[PDB]
Symmetry: D2
Subunit: 115 residues, 4 copies
């Protein structure tokens, strides 16, 4: 598993569960093409998005549907979604974890890249 996503809720101090995540890959014509998607588990994690063979170097966008998450909790959010855009590089280590910490009017995201 070369690409993982982990999402936390800073208001409840818990994993952000059942959050929709969509991954896109940048195509030759500068358009974003759907690549993989899923919903975070009870542990706020999403595994099995893609495979080593499929995850080639290139520019990727990870869209985290935070607006719907906050709505389902009856909390008014600011962002439409959280966006993480990065280049996958074979030179760098091989396992990518995109971590995100959510607040209604703030979020942080971190990339944990390891071997």
């Amino acid at each position: 598993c070369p690409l993982m996503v982990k999402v936390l809720d800073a208001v409840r101090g818990s994993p952000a569960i059942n959050v929709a995540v969509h991954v896109f890959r940048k195509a030759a014509d500068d358009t974003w093409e759907p690549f993989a998607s899923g919903k975070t588990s009870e542990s706020g994690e999403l595994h099995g998005l893609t495979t080593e063979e499929e995850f080639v170097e290139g520019i990727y966008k990870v869209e985290i549907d935070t607006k719907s998450y906050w709505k389902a909790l009856g909390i008014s959010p600011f962002h439409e979604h959280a966006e993480v855009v990065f280049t996958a590089n074979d030179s760098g280590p091989r396992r990518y974890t995109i971590a995100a910490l959510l607040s209604p009017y703030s979020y942080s995201t971190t990339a944990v890249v390891t071997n």
Copy 2:
């Protein structure tokens, strides 16, 4: 000034100067249309992007060119750019400050929204 941006560098503990910022607005055909652009000043702030008149209700995307910033400093970062997407002025005109805190493999962004 209804739309301001402020950027800090978490590695140096200073404002992030000369950071390029591009703002887009979602058009009727659902594509992103260029709305405004600029660069942060010595204080890490970017003012004068737009005016109350031009800043109508809509979905806006604020793109902060973090890669170019880190590269202009001999650092190779993870993200291409920080992307902040939000609906603006749906409850009437508001003043928005988009704050960002940058690290090479991480960033946070916060919105401060007030009513004049």
Copy 3:
């Protein structure tokens, strides 16, 4: 003003108003001595804590009373307070801004240090 504090509320997207702040300085006997205190204003800022003369080199602890803030709003948070501990003025006098971003189960703090 060599030591300022700014606090934002990440739940409301606004400044965190009337947040109590206590500053301590490490004394010769290695105990924390009260140095200065105040509360953030409507802009979430706390100025006038100290003066250039009184703000000597040392190890300072800035305590931000986040629990009292969240409780004063009918919210039950995780942390007692945010604690920011740092050496100040070891390379000559500097101006420090301690920024904090608050959520009920999370906070971030950033130092912006400049030279006048």
Copy 4:
């Protein structure tokens, strides 16, 4: 394991390895008494700090020695250490994870409290 610590490095995009962590419990006389300590693993984690029996309700301080961490990497840091102070409450869920994200002049910490 009711109390865990996880630390990430925002400059390198990796777990923060070999970081010293000291936990204190607040005593009747308002003084902080050593409670548990250790060093983060290769995964930036520290488990086995305490046990269910030992971890009673009370006020705790988790000190993360970030200054030394940055020094060992040849990077000039701002803080002496990161401090996390909180009350352990039996009413709330039972497993506490104190997460911290480190930058030289910034840090965030999050509490993930689950069952």
